[PDB]
Design a protein around this ligand. Structure first.
Ligand SMILES: [Ca+2]
Length: 556
């Protein structure tokens, strides 16, 4: 039997708002993305996942949808969307769209109807509840600041919003609402979309009665929000009424759930989702408050990967990524972005990304080695999440504005949202106008035009790794074995399939290091290396590594 196309595909994530502007308003759009499909095809990309592209007031840049069947005005028209799909198809590429159905915008007609009175047909499309003891229904906090309950004087009741106040949570306990969501998914699937990524998929089911979270639960309320008693029943119902009738791949952003529960979402036999986006690795060094960083080592990094790979088991499947639109830049976060180590470490991280067991997702700009942005003031951030941290921590006196800036500069989602750096023209060729978010001044040294023309660039390395992965089945669907989970200097593992075994060795130190192959194992051939002055000799039982050197070898 063969493995589904998605298990061996290499995905690229495009945050439209920041990819390519073609009309000078400072915001990326569909025409811009369509104009760059040859660029993506040339890198070797099989499929693209685009962030929300629907009608939205943009309080959470696309994640607050006011009409699920209309395109976002800033990105273009439905015609532009249809052309994007037609052009991807001409190139044999597939599209994965973002599905945001844990909540809608408060400007969605369902909510405008719902909030108008206590007795209308849409009242239960959301959660409305009486306050208690003079305040909110319970102690639930919002990820974006303050309480997760907002009072509406029209009826005197509060509505639930785990995220922004303008993102009321949809009520999955209402069958008519579930059916409306299913019809909506069919609208897009009928257009030919090849994949759907389910935004905060683990929070759909709410706890009956809304009791207060205990003091312990309050510490990590994100986890309690993924413990709704009807979650899997709803996901299985969605698969039965929708996905069982199409051949689209589904992936879930499983935010907040304990890793041990992940199999329930992805075991193929359960007929729920196909792939998992987990946060254990990308948030492995993030404090519970989400804006401070905790020092970790490569031992923590690889041990987390080992735990995540183990939960996919036999019937599950993981996506793998080191960056996305909600986290700091890969090279800054996991590598060393200083001028002298940025390219070397970005290449090392590329080797890791493209040799993990699972479907890799490359975030726009990481193939160039883009870095975090040098924020100078709190006003340099656009993200509603930072305004939420200001509300919860600075206005409350828990931290100073200076402390928030210092710390959130290293963790903010905005680090990943600065405009893609195409070349060294005005605003790195992203726009002819004024970018919605400032372009990183390092675009003069980090830009696609320059990378493409240099065989020694980060871009060229990614391109070469993608080709290698495409020609080596073991590198996608092969088994995974960490040679030494306790080693905090050099990351080494094997990928094996049908008697073929490959060894990946990556030095995470900016100093020379040595690596001794497992007893009986010997280098047979060197497929590729980064930052190496010479490949090992056939038969070698050890390797000498330069700072940040990475390599993939066929062993015997
Ligand atoms: Ca535009």
């Amino acid at each position: 039997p063969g493995a589904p196309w998605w298990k061996s595909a290499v995905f690229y994530q495009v945050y439209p708002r920041s990819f390519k502007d073609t009309n000078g308003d400072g915001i990326g759009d569909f025409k811009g993305l369509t104009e760059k499909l040859d660029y993506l095809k040339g890198l070797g990309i099989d499929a693209i996942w685009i962030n929300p592209h629907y009608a939205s007031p943009n309080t959470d840049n696309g994640y607050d949808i006011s009409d699920y069947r209309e395109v976002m005005k800033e990105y273009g028209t439905m015609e532009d969307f249809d052309r994007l799909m037609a052009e991807l198809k001409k190139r044999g590429m597939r599209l994965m769209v973002d599905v945001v159905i844990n909540h809608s915008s408060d400007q969605h007609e369902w909510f405008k109807s719902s909030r108008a009175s206590k007795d209308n047909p849409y009242r239960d499309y959301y959660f409305w509840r009486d306050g208690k003891d003079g305040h909110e229904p319970n102690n639930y906090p919002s990820f974006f600041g303050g309480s997760a309950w907002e009072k509406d004087p029209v009826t005197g009741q509060y509505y639930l919003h785990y995220f922004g106040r303008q993102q009321p949570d949809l009520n999955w306990d209402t069958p008519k609402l579930r059916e409306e969501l299913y019809a909506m998914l069919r609208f897009w699937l009928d257009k030919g979309v090849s994949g759907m990524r389910f935004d905060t998929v683990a929070t759909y089911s709410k706890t009956p009665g809304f009791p207060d979270l205990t003091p312990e639960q309050m510490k990590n309320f994100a986890e309690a929000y993924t413990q709704g008693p009807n979650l899997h029943r709803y996901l299985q119902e969605m698969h039965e009424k929708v996905f069982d009738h199409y051949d689209a791949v589904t992936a879930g952003e499983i935010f907040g759930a304990p890793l041990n529960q992940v199999p329930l979402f992805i075991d193929s036999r359960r007929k729920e989702l196909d792939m998992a986006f987990t946060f254990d690795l990308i948030r492995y060094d993030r404090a519970l408050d989400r804006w401070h960083t905790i020092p970790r080592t490569l031992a923590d990094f690889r041990q987390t990967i080992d735990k995540v790979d183990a939960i996919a088991g036999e019937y599950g499947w993981n996506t793998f990524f080191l960056g996305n639109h909600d986290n700091p830049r890969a090279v800054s976060h996991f590598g060393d972005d200083r001028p002298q180590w940025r390219e070397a470490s970005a290449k090392a991280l590329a080797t890791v990304t493209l040799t993990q067991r699972g479907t890799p997702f490359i975030f726009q700009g990481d193939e160039l080695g883009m870095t975090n942005y040098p924020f100078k003031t709190l006003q340099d951030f656009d993200d509603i999440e930072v305004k939420g941290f200001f509300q919860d921590y600075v206005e409350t006196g828990k931290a100073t504005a200076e402390e928030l800036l210092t710390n959130v500069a290293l963790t903010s989602r905005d680090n990943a949202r600065t405009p893609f750096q195409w070349d060294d023209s005005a605003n790195a060729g992203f726009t002819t106008g004024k970018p919605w978010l400032k372009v990183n001044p390092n675009y003069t040294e980090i830009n696609a035009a320059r990378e493409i023309g240099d065989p020694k660039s980060v871009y060229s390395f990614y391109r070469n790794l993608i080709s290698i992965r495409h020609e080596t089945p073991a590198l996608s669907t092969g088994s995974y074995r960490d040679i030494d989970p306790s080693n905090a200097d050099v990351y080494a593992y094997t990928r094996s399939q049908d008697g073929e075994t490959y060894l990946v060795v990556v030095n995470f130190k900016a100093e020379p290091r040595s690596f001794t192959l497992p007893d009986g194992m010997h280098i047979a051939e060197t497929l590729i290396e980064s930052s190496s002055p010479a490949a090992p000799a056939a038969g070698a039982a050890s390797l000498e590594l330069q700072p940040w050197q990475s390599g993939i070898y066929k062993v015997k």
